[PDB]
């Protein structure tokens, strides 16, 4: 019913914006048979799999996929299965948070800061209302739809739990270690808590407007220096009650980890009073469009 099924004949690739390990993503246009509208979509071409899956199974995850309907989540529009599998999605202008901000860190102020931490954590709390682990939360993984409202996206990681699993167990390949929880890099086990891991380092690279987490520290070392309780510093423009909530998502015990729904209260209320929480040189004279 959310899903749209299309035809080749109802949309467009326009032009190439990216490419990654499952495909390639297009800014394109969607024109819906008989609808007399023009749609710009973002539309994501899969690459072949050794062993590519059945219509059937496409379909069925796709149902699901089409079902994740919240604000601050990027939404499976519709799909087109022909000699390739094509996932038409919303279009977020703007590009990935982790350029904005890089892009635009001399107008960025604290509001906005706070705000985009506050969206971030209500899409994750939907997500894992929706028994969705999404494994790749980083800022290069969430899209700005306008300057004031962010999506996170699944480019292909994320994963749903049966309604009795509480962890994924994955099974190797390339991982984004530096954003990762010590059990995901330890021993490949993904939770929300994990999940949870992933958002503060992503908020840490908000904070610092776009700084590279451990740069300059090699990936195999990560896990050595996270056990001996080193972590990402305290970002110059955050005040204390701020950085402790971001030290407090990467807690070894998993369980003594903030829950998102706990993030989406205490950001909300930091970003009701932006300034108290964040000091940033000439915030009261930054205009963003």
Wanted: charged share 25%.
């Amino acid at each position: 019913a959310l899903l749209r099924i299309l035809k080749e004949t109802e949309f467009k690739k326009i032009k190439v914006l990216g490419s990654g390990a499952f495909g390639t993503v297009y800014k394109g246009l969607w024109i819906p048979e008989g609808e007399k509208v023009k749609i710009p979509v973002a539309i994501k071409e899969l690459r072949e799999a050794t062993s590519p899956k059945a219509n059937k199974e496409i379909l069925d995850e796709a149902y699901v996929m089409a079902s994740v309907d919240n604000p601050h989540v990027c939404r499976l529009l519709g799909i087109c299965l022909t000699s390739t599998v094509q996932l038409i999605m919303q279009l977020m202008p703007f590009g990935c948070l982790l350029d904005y901000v890089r892009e635009h860190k001399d107008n960025i102020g604290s509001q906005y800061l706070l705000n985009w931490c506050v969206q971030i954590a209500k899409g994750m709390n939907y997500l894992e209302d929706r028994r969705l682990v999404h494994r790749d939360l980083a800022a290069r993984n969430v899209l700005v739809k306008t300057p004031q409202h962010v999506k996170i996206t699944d480019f292909g990681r994320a994963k749903l739990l049966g309604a009795e699993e509480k962890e994924y167990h994955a099974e190797g390949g390339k991982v984004p270690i530096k954003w990762m929880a010590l059990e995901s890099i330890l021993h490949r086990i993904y939770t929300h808590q994990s999940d949870v891991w992933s958002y503060g380092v992503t908020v840490w690279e908000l904070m610092t407007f776009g700084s590279k987490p451990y740069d300059g520290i090699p990936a195999s070392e990560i896990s050595s220096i996270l056990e001996k309780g080193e972590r990402l510093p305290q970002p110059p423009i955050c005040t204390i009650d701020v950085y402790m909530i971001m030290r407090k998502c990467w807690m070894i015990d998993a369980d003594s980890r903030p829950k998102f729904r706990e993030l989406i209260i205490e950001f909300s209320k930091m970003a009701r009073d932006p300034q108290r929480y964040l000091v940033i040189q000439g915030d009261e004279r930054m205009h963003l469009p």
